[PDB]
């Protein structure tokens, strides 16, 4: 047995079931959903994409709903999407090189080991706007439909905390730890010991890219007395300059929460958490 704390999610079993569903999916949903030639629905994606060098992929929910061995995966990518996807990004490279074993190739292997992978669940179970998200169901794969009002500029974020020691012709380096930096006050004791002598430069460090988008919500049902809302969210890098004003959109993401400061002055906060959404895919 292997398992995560507060969780019912196996890594390697998910990998195996993922792989078996992956080797086995042939327009099943045509069969099991309805009455509606071809073969191995998914696998063609994964055969074609290799020579073109892309670290992305899209994905339905229904094809899990169709295949036998994926019905439990549905409720688990649902509840733990970033975790289930931290799995699947590994299971995907695993399936890649377990599928390359049947092939001899020119030496493209200098890259795929250096590569990353990521997924995009798009056509998913419907959700009823915003009002439904009483706090029971925060942080979950979600879908929505609406249009655009306002676009912000780019938020950067420290991604490599560079650090310049003051002496001993030495730099220093340290990375982010659940979204903070803990500056090493010390001075690398061996060469020099000045327990709070170090500096900081930005031009060195690595920056993320984040953007926020104002959106207007356009449901299919509303209650007795309803009216528009305007929601903000967060997209991140490699998705920038995609969605803007003048577009209706069907979308997905994750609903979440966050507090804000009382000021630019101290750490005293609000009992009530401003809500938002982090982004997973856009249609």
Partner 1 sequence: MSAALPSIQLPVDYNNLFNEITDFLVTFKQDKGPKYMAMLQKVANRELNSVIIDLDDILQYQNEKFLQGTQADDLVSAIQQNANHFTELFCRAIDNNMPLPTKEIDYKDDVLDVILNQRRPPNLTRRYFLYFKPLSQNCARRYRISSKPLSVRQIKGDFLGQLITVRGIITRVSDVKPAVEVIAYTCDQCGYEVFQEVNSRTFTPLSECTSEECSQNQTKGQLFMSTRASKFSAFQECKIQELSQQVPVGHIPRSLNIHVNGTLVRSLSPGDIVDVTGIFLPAPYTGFKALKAGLLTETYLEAQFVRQHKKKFASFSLTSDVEERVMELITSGDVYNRLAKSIAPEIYGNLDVKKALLLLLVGGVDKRVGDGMKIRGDINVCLMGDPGVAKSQLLKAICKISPRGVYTTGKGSSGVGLTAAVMKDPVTDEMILEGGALVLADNGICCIDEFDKMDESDRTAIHEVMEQQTISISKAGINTTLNARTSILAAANPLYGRYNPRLSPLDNINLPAALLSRFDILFLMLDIPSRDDDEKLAEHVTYVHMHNKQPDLDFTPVEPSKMREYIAYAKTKRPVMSEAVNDYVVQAYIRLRQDSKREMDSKFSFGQATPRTLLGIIRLSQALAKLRLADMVDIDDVEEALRLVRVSKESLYQ
For Zn ion, the binding residues (CB under 5 A) are 165, 167-168, 187, 192
Q: How far apart are the first and last CA of the chain?
A: 38
Q: From the list partner 1, Zn ion, none, which binds 248 (C-beta under 5 to 8 Å, kind-based)?
A: none
Q: Tell me which of 103, 104, 126, 134 binds partner 1, using CB under 8 A.
A: 134
Question: Which residue's C-beta sits nearest to Zn ion?
Answer: 168
Least separation in angstroms between residue 105's CB and Zn ion is 49
Nearer to partner 1, 105 or 225 (CB): 225
Query: Which strand (E) or helix (H) includes residue 83?
Result: helix 81-100
CA–CA separation, 96 and 90 (whole Å): 10
Contact criterion met (CB below 8 Å) for 146 and 248: yes
Q: With CB under 8 A, what is the number of residues at the site for partner 1? A: 43
Among 45, 199, 206, 226, binds partner 1 (CB under 8 A): 226
Contact 249, 122 (CB under 8 A): no
Long-range CB pairs of 190-197 (<8 Å, 24+ gap) are 192/165, 192/167, 192/168, 194/166, 194/167, 197/165, 197/166, 197/167
Q: Can you tell me the distance from the alpha carbon of 94 to that of 108, in angstroms, rounded to the nearest whole number?
A: 16
Q: Which two tokens stand for residue 47?
A: 């055969």
131 contacts partner 1 (rule: CB under 8 A): yes
Q: Could you give the 3-state DSSP secondary structure of residue 211?
A: strand
Q: Among residues 101, 228, 264, 265, which is the contact residue for partner 1, using CB under 8 A?
A: 228
Q: Judged by CB under 8 A, does residue 248 bind partner 1?
A: no
Minimum Å gap between C-beta 137 and partner 1 is: 8
Does 102 participate in binding partner 1 (rule CB under 8 A)?
no
Report the candidate in 235, 159, 166, 221 with the shortest Cα–Cα distance to residue 198: 166
DSSP structural state of residue 128: -
Q: Which stretch binds partner 1 (CB under 8 A): 11-19, 41-49, 98-106, 219-227?
A: 219-227
What the block records as the tokens of 11 is: 């890594």
List of E strands, 27-98: 58-59
| Shortest distance, position 272 Cβ to partner 1, whole Å | 4
* Binding-site partner at residue 192 among Zn ion, partner 1, none, CB < 5 to 8 Å by type: Zn ion
Residue 76 touches partner 1, criterion: CB under 8 A = yes
- The residue ranges that bind partner 1 (CB under 8 A) are 5-8, 72, 75-76, 79, 130-131, 134-139, 149, 178, 180, 182, 222-230, 256-257, 259, 262, 266-275
């Amino acid at each position: 047995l292997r398992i995560i704390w507060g969780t019912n999610v196996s890594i390697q079993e998910c990998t195996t079931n993922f792989r078996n569903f992956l080797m086995s999916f042939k327009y099943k949903f045509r069969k099991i959903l309805d009455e509606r030639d071809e073969e191995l629905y998914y696998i063609k994606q994964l055969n074609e994409m290799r020579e073109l060098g892309t670290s992305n992929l899209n994905l339905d929910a229904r094809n899990l709903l169709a295949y036998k061995q994926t019905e439990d995966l549905y409720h688990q990518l649902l509840n733990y999407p970033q975790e289930v996807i931290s799995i699947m990004d590994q299971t995907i490279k695993d399936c890649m090189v377990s599928l390359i074993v049947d092939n001899n190739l020119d030496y493209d292997l200098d890259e795929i080991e250096t590569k990353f992978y990521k997924v995009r669940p798009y056509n998913v179970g419907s959700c009823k706007g915003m009002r439904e998200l009483n706090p029971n169901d925060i942080d979950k794969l979600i879908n929505l439909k609406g249009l655009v009002l306002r676009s912000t500029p780019v938020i950067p974020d420290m991604k490599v905390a560079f650090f310049k020691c003051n002496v001993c012709d030495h730099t220093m380096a340290v990375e982010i730890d659940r979204g903070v930096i803990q500056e090493p006050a010390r001075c690398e004791r061996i060469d020099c010991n000045e327990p709070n002598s170090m500096s900081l430069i930005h031009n060195r460090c690595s920056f993320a890219d984040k953007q926020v988008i104002k959106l207007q919500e356009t449901p299919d049902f509303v209650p007795d007395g309803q009216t528009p809302h305007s929601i903000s969210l967060c997209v991140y890098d490699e998705l920038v300059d995609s969605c803007r004003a003048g577009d209706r959109i069907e979308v997905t993401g994750t609903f979440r929460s966050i507090p804000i400061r009382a000021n630019s002055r101290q750490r005293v906060l609000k009992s009530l958490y401003k809500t938002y959404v982090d982004v997973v895919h856009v249609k």
